[PDB]
Design a protein around this ligand. Structure first.
Ligand SMILES: Nc1nc2c(ncn2[C@@H]2O[C@H](COP(=O)(O)OP(=O)(O)OP(=O)(O)O)[C@@H](O)[C@H]2O)c(=O)[nH]1
Ligand SMILES: [Mg+2]
Lengths: 1016, 172, 16
């Protein structure tokens, strides 16, 4: 056995278990893991920690012992007598010293040392300075005893600063956090002395680096006087920048220095600010590299430390310049320095590392915005700007990206990525280059024409180069005057066409052509001003739609729909020179045009045509265009509805299911583009489509009932589910975009509900689609205020059965959980009357369902659950001293209070905190604002006429005492007093709750802490 | 073939387990089955320079299932801090994971990953994610559902750990 | 002329 959960402890065996877990593999390592976890979670395990720390031959065992000690210190420290406390404290200091005296251990086991130090810092939080007032003097004194102890002292101080200033919120009560911050500020003169002495006398070494590490953390909070009124600025900016081993951490320190709270009307501080920066830059120039250094090549061939350094350099410059560019600009002697620093960024901007480039680009954006709005200083940075232009043009990223995903039905679907890192980078670059173009149009144009010419002669020809250049050219769209834009676009397109003729290979031609289309798609103004060109492009795209070359068809469809999105008006109007709106021409030949396209590309083409059609404002002509467009799918739909009605077996034919899917998908596409305008088409296929839905759903449910869950994965059921989902998607799409709500209510709602609600109830769980709930959510969102009986039917159909699906655990049917509470929420918003009419038992189930959502370790469910609770309480508040409200309070007020507290005080429900607090405030408000007009108690259990305030207080005190017996009466009383005094202030209330949440995790918390807000 | 320990940390439901599972099997799990303690998954990648193995220590991001917590991090050679771009609090806690991690592992390559970038309603915007800058962490937008930048974290970690920027991932 | 000539060139755009 490797079980060490007995009475006597085997240190060797524990080492064995630890070694099995850390160096072992597989099932053994698994068991070892569970064992170690069980041992580590023993309330009494700390009693063994010291023994381990003294006897274990395993560094990891010591680490785990320190973890157990950490638990004891954080949670049950104040249970121990003062004697024992001091004992453990001196045990840890002594152990730390022992480890430091061991040079091997000190250098090779930083992890164990850091754990030790952190354990000490935990003891400091709990003890210092009230019970350990001599700690900082003793620590500084001991610094001389060993170099390792000196270094470790710097680690301990760094850790203490982190715990007190960096990570104190949400780990400590506001009162205790203030106490520790004040304690650490009081004794910082001494700490800074030790620090400065080490920095001033010491030379580059591990101890110096550790000292600077600590200084980095100090800089977050220390007064600027320790930086500006001492010689530390000179030390950092000169001494520690020359020594390689300290450059990076010194830069980090100077980065934070750049961000200090300093006086804004002190000329000496201004000169000091300039001076350290001038020193740092000159020192980098002298010791590291000049402005002329090729940082791109350097970074590429660098060793990671050098890379980090270069990153840190950019962080330094970008921080300092963003704060102090004005300072560097005002005095013309500083000109050479200013430009030099910017030059570094330029060089740093050339480094191929996205995150570093983004860091530089934020600043670049700042600078070019400032120059745009203050063109007086523009000339100073003319040269810098010119180079920046080239940088950005050379480093344009893809403006839009596409993913090919497989959905739950097994379909291969092309989706456009939205709001990605790359897209935000594109947008940032675009804004920077737009600014740059505004600043000097002539320079931007010259650069772009040069890159293009270098593309033509083949000197800089590559797919990536031409793509980048194209993206760049497209990015500055709408910046030049239409005349200048006209000449520019003409040149670019002409050159690119000549390039295409010159390039050999289908690959190369495709690349350049796709670039041509991207560029033209990026300049809608040029297309609108020149119809002939627009037509030529559209036809050329149609021509491309028959090209089998990989990617070309998608390019053509993407360009087409992109161009129409912007230029729709020019398709619906008769452009003289044309005998008919070009939309008619497109619709005429749609069969021929889209013959070679993939299904999804066809759908995109229809979507495009829909965009165009919705531009026609005459209802008659628009409806005709829509009809003409939908003719092919309409006709196949007619022939299919006839055969299906007559022969149900057709839905067994996979070819039919395909055709049906494509028909509904085409409807979805056109409905997407056309919105309310699509209603005629929807009406054309509606009732039949709902029937087909009922059929496909019945078939899915039957087969799943018969075969089990596996059936849901079969190609047959997958195809059928596609049809089901597409139908639901069409309906949701139209209703979401609908304008004429009467027609929705009176024509669409009733058939839809009849079709899908009863089907959903009667489906087997494994066949129910959450999309049904989603569709219902959208219906309720849009017209729920108009369909009270419809909403009631939705509840009656989905509530009990979906609940019963998802109330077994937190894991089964996740999509169902999400959409169920989204629907409950929207119903509660739009048609709360429905919940009013439910029988008492049904309403109880509702409340149970809300509280069920509370307990979910799922953000999607949890937030909706809390929102429902809030909204419900708001809804019932709207009703006055009405028996329903009174009864609801009598039945559920305390349920809601207790459930909210349960999820507040639960370890793992932090996402809902913001909402939880609100709900709690509201509930408390209802009692402390005297807005509940009936006693919330019973039996006269509290004497007649007892105020609901006193009863709420009693209930809360009792409940919290039961839940948390380790809190004192004084703790609970004070917390409740604070809550009941602070229910009108959200931020203070949240503070008080966080204080309580800190205090329930520990024993012997200070009841005064709840007066924190009242104190300030 | 070299084997490197990869500690995967992040808040609960940020998509760490699903990420590893899809790397292993190719399947995307829809359910949220919270990790308890740690699961160690040997994950292999094939490259033009050979096979590279990762002992992925998929750690529980829930407080109640934390287990050994930072204990899991010892001897890690690389790390992924994952958050969920649809949940602000998961990014809020990124500093806390980073803090826990580097206090055990001083100088290791770390990738910060914004998962679930597929969701339409993205709460943690790209421009907001800057924490990795000062901590010299790699960052990637990823999606375990979408297979978006799916291999990029591991590609970066492999390049760092091998010291070879020319390393490319290849088929078996 | 120049736009019209662009149209002609655009029309002739080929991937072969
Ligand atoms: N939209 C979207 N959802 C995802 C993605 N990856 C995972 N999810 C879902 O989010 C949840 C995350 O679950 P896991 O990955 O097992 O959990 P974890 O992140 O390890 O959390 P713990 O085990 O509690 O630490 C699952 O329910 C997934 O289906 C993704 O890329 N996109
Ligand atoms: Mg997990």
């Amino acid at each position: 056995g490797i079980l060490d959960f007995s009475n006597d402890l085997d240190i060797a065996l524990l080492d064995q278990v630890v070694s099995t877990f850390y160096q072992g593999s597989g099932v053994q390592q698994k068991q070892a893991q569970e064992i170690l976890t069980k041992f580590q979670d023993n309330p009494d395990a700390w009693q063994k920690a010291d023994q381990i720390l003294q006897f274990s031959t395993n560094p990891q065992s010591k680490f785990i012992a320190l973890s157990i000690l950490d638990k004891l210190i954080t949670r049950k420290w104040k249970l121990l007598p003062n004697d024992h406390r001091i004992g453990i404290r001196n045990f840890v200091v002594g152990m730390i010293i022992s480890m430091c005296q061991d040079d091997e251990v000190f250098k090779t086991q930083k992890n164990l040392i850091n754990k030790s130090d952190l354990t000490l810092v935990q003891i400091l939080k709990q003890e210092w300075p009230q019970n350990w007032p001599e700690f900082i003097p003793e620590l500084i004194g001991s610094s001389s005893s060993s170099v390792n102890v000196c270094e470790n002292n710097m680690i301990v101080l760094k850790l203490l600063s982190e715990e007190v200033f960096d990570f104190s919120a949400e780990q400590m009560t506001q009162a205790k956090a203030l106490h520790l911050k004040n304690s650490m500020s009081k004794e910082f003169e001494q700490i800074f002395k030790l620090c400065f002495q080490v920095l001033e006398q010491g030379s580059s070494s591990s101890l110096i680096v550790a000292t600077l590490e600590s200084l980095l953390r100090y800089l977050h909070w220390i007064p600027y006087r320790y930086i500006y009124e001492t010689n530390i600025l000179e030390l950092l900016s000169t001494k520690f920048m020359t020594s390689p081993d300290t450059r990076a951490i010194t830069l980090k320190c100077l980065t934070e220095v750049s961000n200090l709270k300093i006086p804004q009307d002190n000329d000496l501080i201004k000169r000091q600010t300039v001076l350290f920066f001038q020193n740092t830059l000159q020192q980098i120039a002298t010791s590291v590299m000049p402005v002329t250094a090729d940082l791109k090549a350097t970074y590429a061939n660098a060793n990671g430390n050098d890379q980090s350094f270069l990153q840190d350099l950019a962080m330094f410059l970008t921080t300092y310049l963003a704060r102090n560019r004005a300072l560097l600009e005002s005095d013309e002697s500083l000109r050479e320095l200013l430009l030099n620093a910017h030059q570094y960024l330029i060089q740093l901007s050339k480094i191929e590392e996205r995150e570093l480039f983004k860091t530089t680009l934020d600043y670049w954006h700042n600078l070019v915005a400032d120059l745009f709005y203050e063109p007086l200083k523009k000339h100073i940075y003319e040269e810098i700007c010119s180079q920046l232009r080239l940088v950005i043009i050379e480093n344009m990223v893809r403006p839009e990206e596409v993913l090919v995903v497989e959905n739950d039905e097994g379909e291969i679907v092309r989706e456009f990525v939205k709001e990605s890192d790359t897209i935000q980078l594109y947008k940032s670059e675009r804004e920077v280059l737009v600014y740059l173009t505004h600043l000097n149009v002539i320079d931007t144009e010259e650069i772009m024409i040069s890159k293009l010419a270098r593309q033509i002669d083949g000197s800089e020809w590559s797919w990536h180069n031409i793509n980048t250049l194209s993206w760049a050219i497209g990015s500055i769209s709408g910046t030049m005057s239409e005349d200048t834009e006209k000449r520019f676009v003409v040149t670019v397109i002409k050159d690119l066409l000549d390039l295409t003729v010159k390039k050999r290979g289908k690959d190369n031609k495709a690349v350049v052509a796709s670039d041509i289309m991207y560029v033209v798609g990026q300049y809608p103004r040029f297309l609108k001003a020149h119809w002939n060109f627009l037509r030529t492009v559209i036809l050329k795209l149609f021509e491309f739609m028959h090209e089998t070359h990989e990617g070309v068809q998608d390019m053509a469809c993407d360009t087409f729909i992109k161009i129409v999105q912007k230029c729709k008006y020019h398709f619906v109007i008769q452009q003289p020179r044309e005998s008919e709106p070009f939309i008619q021409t497109i619709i005429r030949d749609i069969q021929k045009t889209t013959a070679d396209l993939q299904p999804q590309q066809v759908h995109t083409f229809y979507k495009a045509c829909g965009i165009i059609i919705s531009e026609e404002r005459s209802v008659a002509e628009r409806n005709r265009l829509l009809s003409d467009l939908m003719q092919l799918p309409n006709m196949a739909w007619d022939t299919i509805v006839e055969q299906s009605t007559a022969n149900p077996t057709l839905l067994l034919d996979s070819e039919t299911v395909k055709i049906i899917a494509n028909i509904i998908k085409t409807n979805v596409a056109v409905c997407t583009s056309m919105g309310a305008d699509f209603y005629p088409q929807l009406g054309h296929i509606y009732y039949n489509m709902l029937q087909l839905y009922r059929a496909v759903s019945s078939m899915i449910s039957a087969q799943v009932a018969a075969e089990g869950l596996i059936a849901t994965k079969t190609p047959k059921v997958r195809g059928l589910r596609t049809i089901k989902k597409e139908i639901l998607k069409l309906v949701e799409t139209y209703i979401s975009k609908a304008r004429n709500l009467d027609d929705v209510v009176k024509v669409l709602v009733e058939p839809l509900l009849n079709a899908v609600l009863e089907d959903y109830m009667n489906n087997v769980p494994d066949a129910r689609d959450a999309e049904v709930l989603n569709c219902m959510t959208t219906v309720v969102e849009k017209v729920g205020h108009m369909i009270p009986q419809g909403v009631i039917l939705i509840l009656q159909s989905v509530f009990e059965c979906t609940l019963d699906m998802i109330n077994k655990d937190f894991t089964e049917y996740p999509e169902h959980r999400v959409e169920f509470y989204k629907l409950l929420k929207v119903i509660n918003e739009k048609s709360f009357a429905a919940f009013l009419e439910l029988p008492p038992a049904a309403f109880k189930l509702f409340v149970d369902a809300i509280c069920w959502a509370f307990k979910h370790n799922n953000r999607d469910v949890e937030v909706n659950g809390l929102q429902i609770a809030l909204d419900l309480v708001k809804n019932i508040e709207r009703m006055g001293n009405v028996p329903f409200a009174n009864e609801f309070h009598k039945n559920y007020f305390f349920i809601f209070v207790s459930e909210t507290f349960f999820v507040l005080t639960d370890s793992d429900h932090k996402s809902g905190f913001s909402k939880q607090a609100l709900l709690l405030m509201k509930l408390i408000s209802l009692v402390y604002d005297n807005k509940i007009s009936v006693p919330l108690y019973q039996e006269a259990e509290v004497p007649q006429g007892t105020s609901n305030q006193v009863y709420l207080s009693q209930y809360l005190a009792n409940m919290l005492s039961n839940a948390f017996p380790h809190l004192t009466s004084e703790q609970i009383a004070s917390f409740l007093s604070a809550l009941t005094k602070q229910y009108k202030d959200l931020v203070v209330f949240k503070g008080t709750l966080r204080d309580f949440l800190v205090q329930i995790k520990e024993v012997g918390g200070d009841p005064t802490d709840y007066l924190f807000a009242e104190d300030k | 073939v070299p084997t490197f320990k990869l500690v995967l940390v992040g808040d609960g439901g940020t998509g760490k387990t699903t990420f590893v599972k899809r790397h292993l099997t190719g399947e995307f799990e829809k359910k949220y089955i919270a990790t308890i303690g740690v699961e160690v998954h040997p994950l292999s990648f094939y490259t033009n320079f050979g096979e590279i193995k990762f002992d992925v220590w998929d750690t529980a991001g829930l407080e109640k299932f934390g287990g050994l917590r930072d204990g899991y991090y010892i001897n890690a050679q690389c790390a992924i801090i994952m958050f969920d771009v649809t949940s602000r609090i998961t990014y809020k806690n990124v500093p806390n994971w980073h803090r826990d991690l580097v206090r055990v592992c001083e100088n290791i390559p770390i990738v910060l990953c914004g998962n679930k970038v597929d969701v339409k309603e993205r709460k943690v915007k790209a421009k907001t994610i800057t924490f990795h800058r000062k901590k010299n962490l790699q960052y990637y937008d990823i999606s375990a559902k979408s297979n978006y930048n799916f291999e990029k974290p591991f590609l970066w970690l492999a390049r760092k750990l091998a010291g070879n920027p020319q390393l490319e991932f290849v088929a078996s | 002329g120049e736009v019209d000539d662009l149209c002609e060139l655009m029309a002739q755009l080929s991937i072969n």
